Amino acid sequence: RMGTKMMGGLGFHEVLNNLISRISMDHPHHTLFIILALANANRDEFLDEDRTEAANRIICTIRSRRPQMVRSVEALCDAYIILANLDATQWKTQRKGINIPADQPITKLKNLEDVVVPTMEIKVDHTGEYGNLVTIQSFKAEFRLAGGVNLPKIIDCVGSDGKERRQLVKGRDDLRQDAVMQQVFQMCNTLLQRNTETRKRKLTICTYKVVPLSQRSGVLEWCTGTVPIGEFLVNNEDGAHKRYRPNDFSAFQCQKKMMEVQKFEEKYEVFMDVCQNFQPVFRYFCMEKFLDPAIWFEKRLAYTRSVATSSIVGYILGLGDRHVQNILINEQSAELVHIDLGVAFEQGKILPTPETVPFRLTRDIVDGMGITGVEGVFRRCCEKTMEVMRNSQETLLTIVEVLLYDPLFDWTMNPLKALYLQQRPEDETELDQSFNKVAERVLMRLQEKLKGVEEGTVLSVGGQVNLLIQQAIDPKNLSRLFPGWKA
Amino acid sequence: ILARTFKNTQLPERAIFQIKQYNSVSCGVSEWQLEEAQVFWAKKEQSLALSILKQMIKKLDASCAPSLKLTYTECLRVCGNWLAETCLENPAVIMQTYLEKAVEVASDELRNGKMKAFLSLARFSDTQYQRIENYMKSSEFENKQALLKRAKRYTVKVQRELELDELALRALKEDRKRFLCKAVENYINCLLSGEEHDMWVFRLCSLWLENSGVSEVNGMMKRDGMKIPTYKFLPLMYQLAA
Amino acid sequence: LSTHVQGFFTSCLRFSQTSRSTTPANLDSESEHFFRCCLDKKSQRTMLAVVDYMRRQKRPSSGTIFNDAFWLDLNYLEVAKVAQSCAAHFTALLYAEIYADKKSMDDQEEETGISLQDLLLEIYRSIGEPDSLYGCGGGKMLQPITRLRTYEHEAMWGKALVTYDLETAIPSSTRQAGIIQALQNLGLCHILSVYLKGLDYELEELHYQAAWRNMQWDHCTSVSSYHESLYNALQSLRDREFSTFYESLKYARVKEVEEMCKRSLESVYSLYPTLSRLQAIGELESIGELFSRSVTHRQLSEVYIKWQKHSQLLKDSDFSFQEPIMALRTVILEILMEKEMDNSQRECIKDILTKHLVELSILARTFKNTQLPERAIFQIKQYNSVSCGVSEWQLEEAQVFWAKKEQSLALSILKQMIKKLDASCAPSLKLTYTECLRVCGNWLAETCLENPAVIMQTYLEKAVEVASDELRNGKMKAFLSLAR
Amino acid sequence: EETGISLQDLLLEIYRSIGEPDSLYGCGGGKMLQPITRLRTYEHEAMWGKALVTYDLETAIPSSTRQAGIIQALQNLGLCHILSVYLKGLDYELEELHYQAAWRNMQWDHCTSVSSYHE
Amino acid sequence: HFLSVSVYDALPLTRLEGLKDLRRQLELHKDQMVDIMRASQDNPQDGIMVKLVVNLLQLSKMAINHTGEKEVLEAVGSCLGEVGPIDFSTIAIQHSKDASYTKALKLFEDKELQWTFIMLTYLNNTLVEDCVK
């Protein structure tokens, strides 16, 4: 908002610059990671003017009092930009394997030694006092690569106390949304934590810090011991769906759906024929890692409650297009984390091949619940966590209205953004006032989603969670889904 | 029945004692297992009432090989009306399993039961048609502008695939006609030999002034109109003549 | 040694596997039908558990943990049923899940899979954990029996009372009388004593549940274990005997620990009834030091502050293990009402009781309960309302009345009390007037009993220019209410 | 009966003596402003759930006979078998209400419940 | 007095060490009626105990109840278990939450399981035989 009008009126910009000053005065670690997102938003080596002027003013006001560490973080972020730009496909596309080869021209991020401020790893909020407990002590460059979406880069940082943490640098990927709307998850976590009834159990949504660098670039956190189920369950060399059941196939499951998408009338028949011979094997994910039954039960109940809370969080905050690669399960805590978040809140019902299921719940997930399924714990946890925001309806809606009135918004359906993330499965198969109108429309949609339904009835927590879980397990609608959604 | 109408809970539950201590000694097929489900649905549990019906239909379907014939329709109508307001299952099952089987199976009590089943099926199909109309008015309208903006190489194949997707999704616009046809067929069959529900005679006209202008609904009521009485259509002349 | 030898022999026999499994299945099934089984004889369960983790590498390069059914070739359902009877832990649920998975995999080619739901329900009831209670209160309930009809009404107590005595024919004829006292102790004032006296015509401990919760030393004629010794101590703490009370306290404390520590091998929610009784018996011990000597306002305030600090961490706790300690605190604070003789200090303990009942009502209204937050009205209207104060406790009355679905008396008591509060203006009143205005301003904005243009200049306005962390919190609440 | 305060009490008494449909509509929801415990149960004729836990609050108040007669009428409406034990234990004007639960369930089988119209 | 001066040497042992000294010294005999009696002074540190319980966001800091239960079970088998259980029943804590099942908290076997061959069972048997002395 400060980047919108820095020269307007008489006192507006003045009070805005006076209010954005005390934050940089008291918590510089919270603001130096967000000022760079607009100070280096157009850095290309080898409207926006007002944003650049505001960035220059903020830098000039910060450097006047703050010590010489102001440009150290700028150089550190330029190092990440160089990491995200210099990467080439002729070097680390088929050279991943198992070794971790470093990169020569980077050379310890242009030979850095230590930073006075901590990195994106972790930070505990203060209550009025300054804190410099955790900082950067050293750094090592190994250039790990585990992924194939768009040449992902994985690096490691060793700050104070000597702890190795993995970071993810993305290239040609818009991570601005993954940084502005991801904080809504921790907001809802704090909302459910304030409630005393919702504190007997955890049902917490795990969050991860994300700092954006520029357009089509971003840096997110990678927790140690997190492997996505897309490469752990459905895979040719390592996956419980194939290495355990040799009778059935794994690859032709996608081909059968690609041969059906070409047609519509036989969609339900093809889905039934594919599901009658294929059962879920995701339930064997917990006992293969914890032999002790107590910890096994703890992990399975934590996973069930985590997915039950994430389903409702996704339903209330949109975030459609939940493929098998985005959902990330943790090994030491058994919690599902959304890492991609490619599309906006309300975009699945308007894109080609529209999404029907409002969240991610397949046969693998419904079998991971155990022996009772959804009726036992899933639906009860859902109806318990759905009423935590009905008592505070006038609070959770205030975040969307303030995150949608930003100038850098990219949630509307663009002719290129709605197809650049869907043309890859197609290639694998083939071997303005309108913005404000849509904003008000989706605001009314999210207002009618909770404590009500589009049918006009009340549909309280006793029936809303049942409707949500019935919109998930329905083969007639799953046959109308995208082929790349479920293998 | 008289106790559930006054929002009371303990008095309609008092009726269960005698019918479970003296009448339930023989374990009949289906003679009194309806008021139990009714008094359990009157509470805020909504689970035992929806489970007893699934428990009893399994043994009623095997006993088909009197009062059973007339109660088998209401036993399905109650569950169909109770799962349409709680959304415990997908609505595509009762259309061919529960609400459908209550028509081709079924004496003023039998006529009243058939009337109740027909009106329940008609109102369910009407709700489904209203949902389909709202979806076609909202999602299609929101997608039309997006497609017209995207329509402004490789993009020709994407446009052809979008045209194919449109010609494939018009299947719902073609199937809402069938969704309305069954509603009209149930409305024309319920009001005959039945009273106390004379407020559904113009709901059919609501789906007749613009929906039947291009559909085949004009030819179905002309063959079934010789049995329906016009003594209950008195609030209709004020708009039917217009 | 045998737990490892049973695997070392099976890995080498490759043939003899069926002969070794035929004996194991019979040994595991011989414990059924209420046979002779006790401790030191359930080593088969430990052997089967060890054969599921350390026997993964004993076979060839195949048969992962997902196919651990052929590790011993036994009956997993029978193993789970035997484990739930003796161990009753997560191991039983894991064995039941393995049995269900094996039965589902065998279909791709206590019988008929009907006992699986019963075993799962028994395992969940023996666990009693949060996930177990969630699974029991909805789901896996395919046997609507007359006995299990009340096992899901632990939250609500209104419909649970009419569905408990619904059947006069119960098992052993003790489950009805033994639960009548527990159902009448939740919500009642004085109708429990008549029922206990008329039920005289195993359950003697439940008879004192209503006496030890209200007028303990005054109901000494209610005699026609843990709770019995607690009631004896409550009778003996009348500042005339101390050694007998201190001895009965220790004898009761060393009583329940044995059966609650020997049988409970692993649980997370079974120790809550233990710590609740521990706190309830420690509270009276700590209060006895005050009864042994004179009463001082300073030490009374100190012990109330420490009790509030011990109770504030119980905010993430339900009424399953809080009602007993609350009742114990109420009775140990009410027993000193008869031996007061401290006229200059009576108002001190009166205000202590007032604040305690206020906190009780606050913690009771948050769990959607109705009769428990109304129990606080009895003491504050029979002992505290004898002076007819201006405004010190008339807030929780309106709160518990608004908690109901009447919304009539709660909106009238505030109008009745503000009329005298505006005249009593000519301390605590200054800080309570703002909240008394905010409560009515927020309660008339959701029911629309009057036009909203009045509170803007009369109720919400006067709560600003009138008004010490409590005063700051009250001003914050009033400002946020006006802002919203 | 001055200062216009007795007018509301007189109107409430007249409505209670009338008991007609209009009188019941006027009494329901609250007609006069009275926080007395006696008038707290005069508006709970429709619901019987919360009306049962509100009759045990006037134990120390006078007129215990009326409180017992109202508890008996509230326990005779909704109950299965807990009324016989209460009637047998309340023995320690109201003898007609004691047979209210006996004549409603197992009349000839509860002939030992003796320890007017309904008699 | 000497033992107290040696235990409180350059250490307050109020917030976490006061409980760690009683939770890590559970390797003594069944007649450990001294630690249970010294832990009764935790009532004066309720403000610190509440903060320590609120800061715990994982499955930890609750091993005190498991240690007390293990001590009670060990004293029930031996003699003079009345005073032992009376001293052990002084937890004065009722906020043991954020858990579903407590683990065995055994590390001797985890440290010895470093071997990958089949000789791990022999090492475990040797350790179990040497533990009985």
UniProtKB/Swiss-Prot annotation, chain A:
Residues 139-431 form the PI3K/PI4K catalytic domain. Changing D321A: Loss of kinase activity. Changing R441H: In B-cell chronic lymphocytic leukemia. It comes from the Eukaryota. The modification N6-acetyllysine is found at K449. Changing R172H: Found in a patient with early-onset breast cancer; uncertain significance. It is linked to Ataxia telangiectasia: A rare recessive disorder characterized by progressive cerebellar ataxia, dilation of the blood vessels in the conjunctiva and eyeballs, immunodeficiency, growth retardation and sexual immaturity. Patients have a strong predisposition to cancer; about 30% of patients develop tumors, particularly lymphomas and leukemias. Cells from affected individuals are highly sensitive to damage by ionizing radiation and resistant to inhibition of DNA synthesis following irradiation. Defects in ATM may contribute to T-cell acute lymphoblastic leukemia (TALL) and T-prolymphocytic leukemia (TPLL). TPLL is characterized by a high white blood cell count, with a predominance of prolymphocytes, marked splenomegaly, lymphadenopathy, skin lesions and serous effusion. The clinical course is highly aggressive, with poor response to chemotherapy and short survival time. TPLL occurs both in adults as a sporadic disease and in younger AT patients. This is Serine-protein kinase ATM. It comes from Homo sapiens. The gene is ATM.
UniProtKB/Swiss-Prot annotation, chain B:
Changing R203G: In T-prolymphocytic leukemia. Changing Q159P: In T-prolymphocytic leukemia; also in a lung adenocarcinoma sample; somatic mutation. Induction: By ionizing radiation. It comes from the Eukaryota. Changing A241P: Found in a patient with familial pancreatic cancer; uncertain significance. Found in pancreas, kidney, skeletal muscle, liver, lung, placenta, brain, heart, spleen, thymus, testis, ovary, small intestine, colon and leukocytes. It is found in: Nucleus; Cytoplasmic vesicle; Cytoplasm, Cytoskeleton, Microtubule organizing center, Centrosome; Peroxisome matrix. Changing T127S: Found in a patient with T-prolymphocytic leukemia; uncertain significance; also found in a patient with early-onset breast cancer; uncertain significance. Changing L48F: Found in patients with familial pancreatic cancer; uncertain significance; also found in a lung adenocarcinoma sample; uncertain significance. Phosphorylated by NUAK1/ARK5. During the late stages of DNA damage response, dephosphorylated following deacetylation by SIRT7, leading to ATM deactivation. Acetylated in vitro by KAT5/TIP60. Deacetylated by SIRT7 during the late stages of DNA damage response, promoting ATM dephosphorylation and subsequent deactivation. Homodimer. Dimers or tetramers in inactive state. On DNA damage, autophosphorylation dissociates ATM into monomers rendering them catalytically active. Binds p53/TP53, ABL1, BRCA1 and TERF1. Interacts with NBN (via FxF/Y motif). Part of the BRCA1-associated genome surveillance complex (BASC), which contains BRCA1, MSH2, MSH6, MLH1, ATM, BLM, PMS2 and the RAD50-MRE11-NBN protein complex. This association could be a dynamic process changing throughout the cell cycle and within subnuclear domains. Interacts with RAD17; DNA damage promotes the association. Belongs to the PI3/PI4-kinase family. ATM subfamily. It is linked to Ataxia telangiectasia: A rare recessive disorder characterized by progressive cerebellar ataxia, dilation of the blood vessels in the conjunctiva and eyeballs, immunodeficiency, growth retardation and sexual immaturity. Patients have a strong predisposition to cancer; about 30% of patients develop tumors, particularly lymphomas and leukemias. Cells from affected individuals are highly sensitive to damage by ionizing radiation and resistant to inhibition of DNA synthesis following irradiation. The FATC domain is required for interaction with KAT5. This is Serine-protein kinase ATM. It comes from Homo sapiens. The gene is ATM. The chain holds residues 2260 to 2525 of 3056 of the full protein.
